[PDB]
Symmetry: D2
Subunit: 433 residues, 4 copies
């Protein structure tokens, strides 16, 4: 039997040490009384869409922040990241004739797993930065001592963000007639800004053709579906935002539409797996180089006993050198046991380089290589490359080569997100041809 708190009985990684247990309890509790970020019916809709992807009739586009922060909470940043998602989706949908399920790593992706539980600088040792939901980035005691009030600040930032995202998606910003205005200024001059300008003109032509045919009024051209997701890492936050569906009595984690378990917290006997095991959400698990096929099958027996094709997204993050060696054996076990999974590629988290400095780098070319290989590997085994899962930004920076080089990892910029979409689009077209 499961309950929203049965995770507290399991061994657990990556949890911060709070100075005041009773204070923490009071905040968990204020938060239990706050409205949910999502409605359970919506999470069932995403499951429905997941089952399409899993059967080879759609593709999953998941993208957003490494880890959102309190210091960067603006409409502009939310809007520009959403623009990049719309761009990518429209490119894939059109070139490949393929529905694309849109999931933002947004409105709740605050917590960070870490290698080390603390950090040392010139003889001083303090608790590690675990994301703004837990503590602050600044190297000083007050910043680093976990503050449970941050749970609420993270909640508030999330309702503001999701509220605006919902409004963009339904209220006209995502209307296909706005296809041009989704290209960010940044993508000004490359051949790229121009490969998209043509695709966009085509879409204009498509829509002109439809009004000429008498289809100018379809709501499906004016709005789109948009879902949110984050790593369920801080189980305090998740529990508090876990609610029963009134219609079915079934528990959903209503902090977001989809939750996923990290590579460092996926212990079969651990708290994170216990938590997500009993919620009705569609969910994911990060699958890195350390996963063998036995563990994988056991993990699936726990997270998808009924072998439902809408339930479980396996997010493969191997590294461009390792994907070829490791993935196949994993696909083959799944095939052999007749399991229904959605396979996605996280081509970022297994390609980060951390130098003694503590400085992180990602070569964008490695990122493309892992993707290209993920598609190759699925081609060969007779299975479906279902999804992509990336960190990206609408901001005008270049973080990958080809706060985000230390505590966080480097995000794709808009140019890079687009080249990737074009690449994915061609491959998908070939798959379907």
């Amino acid at each position: 039997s499961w309950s929203p708190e049965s995770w507290r009985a399991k061994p657990i990684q990556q949890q911060p040490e709070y100075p005041d247990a009773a204070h923490l309890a009071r905040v968990e509790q204020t938060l239990a009384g706050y409205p949910p970020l999502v409605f359970a019916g919506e999470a069932r809709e995403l499951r429905r869409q997941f089952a399409e992807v899993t059967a080879g009739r759609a593709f999953l586009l998941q993208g957003g922040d490494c880890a959102e922060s309190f210091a960067e909470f603006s409409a502009a940043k939310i809007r520009d990241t959403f623009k990049v998602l719309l761009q990518m989706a429209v490119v894939m949908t059109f070139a490949a004739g393929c529905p694309v399920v849109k999931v933002g790593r947004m409105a709740g992706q605050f917590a960070k797993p870490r290698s080390s539980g603390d950090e040392t600088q010139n003889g001083v040792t303090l608790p590690a930065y675990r994301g703004d939901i837990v503590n602050g980035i600044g190297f000083d005691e007050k910043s680093r001592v976990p503050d449970p009030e941050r749970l609420l600040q993270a909640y508030h930032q999330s309702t503001a963000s999701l509220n605006l995202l919902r409004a963009f998606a339904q209220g006209g910003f995502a209307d296909l007639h706005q296809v041009h205005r989704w290209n960010l200024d940044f993508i000004a001059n490359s051949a790229l800004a121009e490969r998209y300008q043509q695709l966009a003109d085509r879409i204009d032509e498509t829509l002109a053709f439809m009004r000429a045919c008498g289809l100018d009024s379809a709501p499906q051209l004016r709005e789109t579906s948009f879902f949110t997701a984050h790593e369920a890492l801080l189980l305090n936050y998740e529990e508090a935002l876990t609610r029963r569906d009134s219609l079915t009595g079934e528990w959903y984690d209503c902090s977001a539409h989809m939750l996923w378990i990290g590579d460092r917290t996926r212990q079969i006997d651990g708290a994170h797996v216990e938590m997500l095991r009993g919620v009705g959400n569609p969910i994911g698990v990060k699958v890195g180089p350390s996963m063998d096929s036995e563990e994988l099958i056991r993990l699936i027996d726990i997270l998808n006993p009924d072998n439902d094709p809408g339930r479980l997204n396996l997010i493969v993050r191997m590294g461009a050198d390792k994907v070829g060696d490791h993935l196949p054996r994993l696909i083959q076990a799944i095939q052999r046991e007749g399991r229904q999974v959605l396979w996605s590629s996280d081509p970022m988290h297994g390609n980060t380089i951390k130098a003694s400095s503590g400085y992180k780098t990602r070569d964008f070319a490695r990122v493309l290589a892992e993707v290209r290989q993920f598609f190759e590997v699925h081609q060969a085994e007779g299975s479906y490359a279902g999804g992509i899962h990336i960190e990206m930004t609408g901001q005008n920076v270049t973080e990958c080569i080809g706060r985000y080089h230390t505590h966080c990892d480097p995000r794709l910029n808009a140019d890079q997100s687009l080249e990737l979409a074009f690449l994915i689009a061609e491959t998908l077209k070939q798959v379907r041809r």
Copy 2:
């Protein structure tokens, strides 16, 4: 006051001399009791579409036979001519983002006007061939004496033809997924068969994009609208198929959706103008080089007193050398009097060459020249080039250079119809740009 027979009181051109008045009366009368080819509501729908064209929001595609015959009455011929119309319409609709109203010169276009009321061959003089509805093409007394039973044979051929055309249009033949199968074999190798193959692939892409967006089920992609038209020349036939709309009590000529008056029978005080003056159909008038602006205005006062923009299609057939000289003055009068008309180009009937032999020729290049000039002239005067009106065939012949060289005029073949559509499509795109 008007009635279905008030035309009989006017002077009249082009009517055959029947040997037995009472026999003719008996047939007119059997035919008055036969069901109508069209339903009055449909004719009102075409008016509606005509008013769109007239306001610059659609374009009229009218095409079919010179004059249908009893000897060529096959599903194959009807199907192939319809294919050519679908091709042309899809090209124009897509390249130009413009609804195209489809009217077939079909299911009733049997009667022929002639220069001369008789014909002489080696000292023998017989009544002229006026179409199979009246008499036969063969040079011999029995053939040439008007036979009123032919009124019925023409009716029967028309219900068979329209019935099949309706079935093609609504029952799946005109479904946009069939876009490739509308190219006739004939159009095998040119760059042309290939310019259309690409446009067709684009359309496939457009439709894939729409099912990816969730629009796979729209009835408007599965069926299309199709209307019929002929020259109301034989007023016996028209009268008999003229019926009252039960809903409104208003008279419609239900032999076809649209009727038109020829260049040789458009006398202001004549029978043809009297007939069409009192029916509710949308209608047309052939406007040739002999029309001045005064006569034109008077004609319009009679055929469209209420200045309704759905009522009246002016079908300009000037000749490629004369269109530039004559049309402008006509447009200007109309503009100056604030009349609502649909302007169309018949670029065929003013470009036929009849040599002493009696052999008729049309140079296709002249045909393109008159069209190109018709568009130019409208460009200059600030008015709308609304339509095209051609004779064409799906059969594998070449009759225009670039029975149909004697009694009839040479039709466009499929290749030629397509080049014309591409040309019209570019021009329309430019108009709208």
Copy 3:
């Protein structure tokens, strides 16, 4: 192996004796060159709809003439019979929330099977009247000698009829906003004209609600689907109108969408079964009291080898006293052999009374009794009462008690057709509840 003429090698019932074989051949042949009444894609659509009915997700409404005649060929009669079908369908569709497949016994139902191959009146013996497609109703040699020219007259009447029916169905007559105008004058005063007036007001309310919701423009409210059917009795006519689908190369009988075999011509080794065995149409077989379960299974092995749920409609005509005794054993065999069939009730042809006079009567109450029992019997066996199959008229007569009392059988009038629809509607609602 099958061909359009392999029926000529089998023994055969109910065929007329023609005086001139070569004349007959010449007409079969003129007719082979005439366009088809329907397009093969349409017949595949009806199969599709049949498979819905068979699976319990729609209901079949088949209705029209006993046998059309040359003397009654008017738009008014076609229109009024169609009105009665629309009425019935709208009643069933709305009260029961059930799609209704509409099939007219129209545009080809000319031929009549007879008990006796001849008829005697005061010492004179002449060939029996077999419908106007074969010979005339008048008791005299010239009338009664089979005339193959009648094949063409029947064809011509059919294209005229179908052309008009297609126009009504698609061009606005069947638009749901016209729901009131479908009640015929006749149904003036009963409680009945009033039960329908209320249902119609409800429909108005439904449509107002939909335009208030923003659904005013759906093509599915403006037009409806309509199919034709007749007994394939005269195999000369059927063969000539049997054509290959260009797309698939498969033979379809294109005289009508659906064909059926009569109770007197369903010999397993006979010509009629041979003919329909090789066409792609959906088809039916009249199943009367003389059918046992063995014969039934054999018949199905022949007409639906692949056990396709769209293929075969079994039209049960038992008599109100016999339906209870005979039908169950037939259903049970089918169930036991896992066959897919569409079950329909013809509650007319097994309830006709023929007195020594030769005068035929049907008591309408018997008709309702057989239907009510057909539904009861399906209720009990766990199977689906799929359809109704009746003869009816929009004309203002009363032929059933509660030419059509001699050569033909008495048709339901409009009042009676409506009471039946209301009855069927309630029962269907109960089935689905």
Copy 4:
């Protein structure tokens, strides 16, 4: 020239006195950097819908809290109030065939205007409670001293509320198939719970009929439009959430879709009118007994110079005894000057009784009387009764007879909201009949 702060230069009512100007400035400013509650395109959509109502083609349903509080911030309360709105709208839309524009007094309606700037209890005098956005309800210094941090708490409650409302409206809660589940438990037994149960069954029938017709998939049956509104009273909050539309450069108050000015703050030369004068939102003005026709016209010259029919909602709150005397003269001036306005009835704020105690009462019967009279008055003058504007709750209380009896006014309960909707629905049906 206007700017987001030009209101600060005008004289101003109802503003609280803050102890620390610089602290207040710091909070206004944190809030200026927070994302907006709504997107400007959405506000333009509401204008569009307002112009429909104004032209007599829709009706406005505005309903929600008197004044939201921090102590009642639960998903349950937001959900239940939304249920009551859906109920009311579905009743009106169906019975009357009339689109209903839905505006919630929600996600920002926190501030309260007051009669008196302070309050005295047993010799102690403190600043008056002005809503939780300003200060607390408790009678004590700390509560009553305006606290600018409350601006943020109100913002946070609003994004949480709107986010959930958006999710309900689009994500499946407002799907018309859920029509039954919108009736609150409360409305258990009356004839009323039953008048709605029948209307709901009808809707079920309507939808069954539409899937039978092939319309089961329309997005317009799955989701609905929902807008928010509040009195723009605290101009600090409004200014900070006033942003430029990126597309047009035009200023919108993005705290809500619609803003309105109270009866006590509508001074023509005042700050509130200055603020709303320069934003692009649709807006409203409370029109109470003190308004004459001169002032009204001047007010309209300021708030709708361009006389746009989407811009301005006049919310008439007269009292049931005064509506008859006062409204007509106001309508007549408007008619005479040819002004485009949306007329709505607030039948609550002019019917509150405040006894010496300070205890407020509303008799529900007075409320129905004012509405009924508002419709009568519009009937007589030839103008359109456009809207209703009420305070209501999904909670199981009875506050009107037939915190909310002191600081706030008594809200309609669910039973009462429904009786009102039924009443409005009948009247609207009669108007349209």
